[PDB]
Design a protein around this ligand. Structure first.
Ligand SMILES: NC(=O)c1ccc[n+]([C@@H]2O[C@H](COP(=O)([O-])OP(=O)(O)OC[C@H]3O[C@@H](n4cnc5c(N)ncnc54)[C@H](O)[C@@H]3O)[C@@H](O)[C@H]2O)c1
Ligand SMILES: NC(=O)c1ccc[n+]([C@@H]2O[C@H](COP(=O)([O-])OP(=O)(O)OC[C@H]3O[C@@H](n4cnc5c(N)ncnc54)[C@H](O)[C@@H]3O)[C@@H](O)[C@H]2O)c1
Ligand SMILES: O=c1ccn([C@@H]2O[C@H](COP(=O)(O)OP(=O)(O)O)[C@@H](O)[C@H]2O)c(=O)[nH]1
Ligand SMILES: O=c1ccn([C@@H]2O[C@H](COP(=O)(O)OP(=O)(O)O)[C@@H](O)[C@H]2O)c(=O)[nH]1
Ligand code: NA
Ligand code: NA
Ligand code: NA
Ligand code: NA
Lengths: 338, 338
């Protein structure tokens, strides 16, 4: 199929592009480079084994999106583009609503204009809000996300749902992500955050590579087995594969298809730390710090629906997640070149 | 004060502009004329007793909004501009999210750019969602609106709330409207809907003027005293006054100030019909039809907060609402001239 991958040069999108190309799809990447570099492009092509077309541009530019869509006879769109720093979202709400809410709105309006009706959206477990029932199941009513970031995702899910009701020929997949970690097994493609990493894995990795002193573990008094927060970690390669399957199986199948994409099990902060120390060959330095504002103690996905309906399930392990991350971090300590 | 009134040429905004001018404020009206006519302008000036500046333009145009704001040294913004046909919103969701969500986002981003930090937003009782507890109180957590229109309003309230948290010097009033009816007592300014009116009052008025056959009363089997739906009707003049007070009293008072603006009591469809028959001097023709999709049986506002904090309360009656409406309808059967 002809697929437009917005945010295609970023973390999850890069890996997704590789798997898409491996599957022989024609890929057009759209990215504004606010959080990624052109240097990942040749890596995508090499690992994907096929050239993906790249367009530098912004999802907010409806006219350009329309042009791209038509120009490339796109059949389906995978939408990864947006902002995702939770804390920053609290500080700069407008930029989040603009990039995420308006950004998606501009893109789907362009789709309408171009007659494209298959969409895959990068959603989030934040949409469940403060749900005491774990694991989280797609059948659960959404809650109230605590940050502007979380809210922006839930708002987009609602807008897409309304759009589908109004244009019932559309196929829209709402893929709810949990905690994506890992890197392509080659060690040549991975997460390349700028500045202080907000997520656990990359932070640990930077401590391990020697850039940082100690990992601050946010809270050690939660009602979990070891007192640290528990999450559902998923290897970016499994996530990428889930996207290829969803795209292939849902294209032209009218409806709003919601799926949690996660491993279906929880791991604590210590479990992750331990796996990484094991991977890197040295004990990762860490200390206990106060709980992080707005954090939930524990949650993980219920991934039965994706297994059942798409025949998709994770295959990589937590150790692999840590190992692949360390491999990338260590092979490319400065990330992608400028 | 110097106030920018978006949607100023529409129903509620026109009346608000009149009262603002009467209070000696300098008013700048911004409207795209998608649901109003330039012919209301001279009426606003005449009834307001002072000239309001008018700019034809769109809230979505951030650059223009910014320019206006600066050019006119605006101190505060009253935001009435947006789309509000509920049924159409279900059919054309994108236009609603764009005009309402993105439209407000563009406007407040322009405000940021221009250093304007006082805002008044036209909110809605739809934000309470399907709340069984009536009357509705500001202290109630919001619910889930059933239409794209309802959702767009709640999304804006959330975005504004986040904005205020991030720029705590801002003063933002979330004015939740219930069922605005009536017309300026002069009979020369009123609601001028195009095509079939969606709301009860105007529909009744068109039946009365002879344009329509019979009012279809949506449902007669609700758990209400007479079996018809019950709502909180508020005279547009009281609503207008509430806006002047809110603007004057909340300017430069940091926070998110939420107030329901309603009469605080409920009236059924039959009560409204009866009041109008009385006003127009002839029995209004009507029949019972099936319930309207998504309608709630009964709800009204709890307006104690506005009374207490702003010393504001309604003063016009249901009869006045009907009378003023008939007066306008009858004096100007073709509405505002083209
Ligand atoms: N739990 C969660 O909510 C969860 C977990 C991770 C990622 N996600 C979502 O998955 C998506 C991909 O995440 P990621 O980790 O790859 O992040 P990322 O920052 O690496 O990728 C996003 C890409 O979008 C691009 N971009 C940003 N705004 C843009 C715009 N306006 N126009 C064009 N390009 C733009 C960036 O330059 C970047 O290459 C995002 O939507 C993210 O919010 C959600
Ligand atoms: N229960 C409720 O939710 C409730 C009741 C009535 C009205 N309201 C809200 O109050 C406001 C005023 O309502 P009204 O009855 O006066 O409606 P209205 O249609 O008469 O007024 C809206 C005005 O906004 C203008 N407009 C629309 N989109 C615009 C845009 N993108 N840029 C510039 N101008 C634009 C229209 O031309 C019109 O003059 C609206 O926001 C409406 O949704 C809410
Ligand atoms: O420097 C860090 C980053 C994260 N965490 C914890 O690691 C888990 C995952 O955090 P992350 O921010 O990566 O993603 P989230 O689960 O919030 O989407 C949570 O329990 C966080 O409290 C931590 O202790 N230190
Ligand atoms: O042609 C109409 C319009 C409205 N209504 C009823 O009148 C009340 C107010 O309807 P409206 O659409 O004006 O506003 P809402 O309360 O939905 O905001 C509700 O009980 C509607 O079911 C009716 O019976 N016939
Ligand atoms: Na429809
Ligand atoms: Na670098
Ligand atoms: Na802040
Ligand atoms: Na007319």
């Amino acid at each position: 199929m002809r697929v437009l991958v917005t945010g295609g040069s970023g973390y999850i999108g890069s890996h997704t592009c590789v798997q898409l190309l491996q599957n022989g799809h024609d890929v057009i990447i759209l990215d504004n480079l606010c959080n990624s570099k052109r240097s990942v492009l040749p890596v995508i092509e090499r690992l994907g084994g096929k050239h993906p077309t790249f367009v530098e541009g912004d999802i907010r530019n409806e006219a350009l999106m329309t042009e791209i869509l038509h120009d490339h006879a796109i059949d389906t769109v995978i939408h990864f583009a947006g902002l995702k720093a939770v804390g920053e979202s609290v500080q700069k709400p407008l930029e989040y609503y603009d990039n995420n809410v308006n950004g998606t709105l501009r893109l789907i309006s362009a789709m309408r204009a171009a007659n494209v009706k298959n969409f895959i959206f990068s959603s989030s477990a934040t949409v469940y809000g403060d749900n005491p029932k774990i694991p989280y199941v797609e059948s659960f009513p959404t809650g109230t996300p605590q940050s502007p970031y979380g809210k922006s995702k839930l708002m987009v899910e609602q807008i897409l749902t309304d759009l589908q009701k109004a244009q019932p020929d559309w196929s829209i997949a709402l893929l709810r992500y949990f905690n994506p970690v890992g890197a392509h097994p080659s060690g040549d493609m991975g997460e390349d955050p700028q500045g202080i990493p907000n997520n656990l894995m990359p932070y640990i990795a930077q401590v391990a590579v020697g850039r940082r002193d100690s990992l601050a573990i946010f809270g050690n008094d939660y009602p979990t087995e070891d007192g640290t927060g528990v999450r559902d970690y998923i290897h970016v390669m499994d996530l990428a594969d889930g996207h290829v399957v969803a795209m292939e199986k849902l294209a032209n199948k009218p409806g709003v298809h919601i799926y949690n994409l996660g491993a279906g099990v929880g791991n604590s902060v210590l479990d992750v730390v331990n796996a990484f120390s094991k991977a890197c060959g040295k004990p990762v330095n860490y200390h206990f710090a106060p709980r992080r504002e707005g954090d939930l103690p524990a949650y993980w996905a219920d991934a039965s629906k994706a297994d059942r309906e798409l025949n998709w399930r994770v295959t990589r392990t937590l150790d692999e997640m840590a190992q692949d991350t360390w491999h990338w971090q260590s092979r490319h300590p400065q990330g992608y070149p400028d």
